[PDB]
């Protein structure tokens, strides 16, 4: 129940340690990864980053997995924040799907020299 | 190789080895011997001496103070630490309430004939006292010039972090050190829990019983020697440990460690003490000694420290087979 | 006129006790229900929850009943918050109506064995 | 069953029963008797003694201090509390202004021949002094080592909460206790208003007049006994209460309570005192006594405490018919 204070460029966020400990493999969930951002003088973790985005990042832990991009935050900026906080590929995949994306197919000519070469001009 | 170290991240510089007064001062040894032990330590660069209101019901502090006063050493050249918690039979004479911390420290200072101690420690955690009260009291005695700094003893890392957050919350002074038990057969806290506190909030460790009360010296390889701590009236509990099943197991492992000592060219006690100082997280080790011979030998642990290679440490871990999981 | 401080995951809210005492049966209006969330060290009630939503929750008490979902807050998340703060079914009903909902009808065959059974395949 | 209790949620441990000095010390009883009462209480584990600048115009504090000094009891084994508000005829010698709290406590400490008290109380609320000034003054005398803690007396829960919020606002020290009147015929505040403060901000209750000045002892079943408090010069007001219409009603109900006492196997005074300690919210009850007999009997209330079952409590509520609405 120990509380944690995360300061996003001046904007103060507060949560419980158990809330973050829920997702260990993320930056805020792993003590060794967030250690770098701790300010022992103010007893808070400080990130010189985008403010509007963190709300959703924190809600992700509080909700237990809900990663919704705030209406007022550009998809390119929010996606960078998701990657910075290391939420993982599963969450990222779940995210792009909802944002209306996903899809990657197309093998490739194995018989190199011949097939693969012909299948490229056809 | 660095004889002097910062206590945690504070500006207080202590020798990597200090001398304690539990069992010995005002108890097992004569005041003459106590003066001899302290003189030997001081002349060898040791500047850290630890005592407690509970040791020999206050007599340890009285003896420690008589020596300092008699020798005339400059107060600024010493780092005296004392612990508070058990100060008497009355209900209000124990614990970490504001009442006992102030009265306890004031009384210790009186017995020590000193205006102040460099570090005052809560001898153990107190479930019956809110953290705020304790941190405000420690901060108070520091502002009154009764102590320069304060520390915890036998507190979990969770409790130490609580005192620190409470201090930040109310603009109080955080603790700078934890006095934890540490030797080859008690490695958990110092190796797994404290390092994080050291790097995160600068709290350093000042370890005690490096020889597990003598058990790790090898002197009990075959029975309870006469005049050893284990034979003293009142330490039957220690005697029970040594002769226990687990006790026999330790003694067996010590015979394995002896070969390591010979390879490093030192005695077992020197190896045991040097082992405790192998990691930065440990600021200093408090030694115990019933005579000058023991102290002169133990101080030699500093020469062994440089030889403790990764390989050697791994070897000792195999023999002990008790390395704690991170 | 005593003042109350409610801290929503770091976001600081402040109001008068009489404003909350207006709706006793809610979590914030009932001393026994909010007691659990009080932090005696900072003299505030702390909730490890969704930030954007609380604005409207507090305005509900200040306005005297107006429960409007913030444009930037998903209906599913806001509805959960309304239930958590225990605003009551009346407010909830009033809310869903405005959000464009409400409606539940259809009895059910009483003559069990016969009627109710036939009325299901017809 | 727990003789010692924490005062509210602070770390200060007080006996569930304390001894007061109103009316008796320096007034109704001889200093010899006072020494006898205190010795009896101390030897029985009671560590809490309450006095006030107003009691017998300061003589009560002088008598209390003479005994402590004479007996030589360790200061750390006692919990001395004193109240401030009425300190003289002059306009500035009363109230909770910074001026009177500092001067008042300094003078009490002088009469007590003590460096400090464990808890200093605002004897009553002060409408003419801003809360901030009062909380800053109490905090000041604590930082000066004149008191360990402070508390309120006769304050509403609204006022206690104000002092607490003011303390948090300015990083001052909140009060840890309220000294409220409490007995079978005055239950409102302690049962309805204080419990919330206890659980919310840790403020505990230290109750007074458990026997309603003797009224609940049953000694007034048929008239004003000679030498009873009600007969003393200056307590006509108390005599008026006892003989009043409501007074007769109480005495009638006490005759009903007597059967409860016999069933529990104790005397009425013991039942009345034990009743006050039935709920956790009450940290301690301050007793009054004009002789040793009374004190020895009253202390027996601790043996009754375990027998106060829900059933018995419900029964007493029926007889009293004054249980406060939550
Ligand atoms: N924070 C706490 O709660 C706490 C608790 C305990 C201790 N401490 C501190 O830590 C200090 C050290 O603890 P400790 O006394 O247990 O230390 P230790 O190093 O474990 O044991 C020292 C004792 O072992 C024996 N010994 C030492 N060197 C020896 C050698 N070379 N050969 C043979 N025997 C030797 C001596 O006893 P014999 O000669 O009598 O056998 C000596 O008294 C204390 O004095 C105290 O200041 C703190
Ligand atoms: N916070 C405040 O403003 C405040 C106000 C008032 C008091 N107090 C504190 O609370 C303390 C206790 O108050 P209190 O004196 O009113 O207490 P109490 O318990 O209501 O009354 C005690 C008095 O009743 C009589 N008595 C006690 N035990 C008896 C027994 N077993 N049999 C017969 N008579 C008995 C004695 O008077 P007689 O023998 O003379 O009849 C004795 O002086 C005070 O001394 C003071 O420290 C605080």
Numbering used by the authors:
A (entry chain B), C (entry chain B): 32 to 153
B (entry chain A), D (entry chain A): 36 to 361
Publication text:
Here, we have used x-ray crystallography to determine the structure of a complex between CTX and the paddle chimera, a mutant of the Kv1.2 K+ channel from rat brain, with particular focus on the influence of toxin on the selectivity filter structure and distribution of ions in the pore.
The highest resolution data were obtained from the complex of paddle chimera with the selenomethionine derivative of CTX. Superposition of the channel in the toxin complex onto the channel in the toxin-free structure shows that the channel undergoes no discernible structural changes; RMSD 0.33 Å, residues 321–414, main chain atoms, molecule A; RMSD 0.16 Å, residues 321–414, main chain atoms, molecule B. This is consistent with the idea that the toxin fits into the mouth of the channel in a lock and key manner. The oblate-shaped toxin binds asymmetrically to the mouth of the pore domain of the channel such that the wider end is closer to the symmetry axis of the channel than the tapered end. In the structure of the paddle chimera, as well as other high-resolution K+ channel structures, the selectivity filter contains four distinct ion-binding sites or positions, S1 through S4, S1 being the most extracellular. In the toxin-channel complex, only sites S2 through S4 have discernible electron density. The top ion-binding site appears empty. Thus, Lys27 is within the range to make hydrogen-bonding interactions with all four carbonyl oxygen atoms that would otherwise constitute the top-half layer of coordinating ligands for a K+ at site S1.
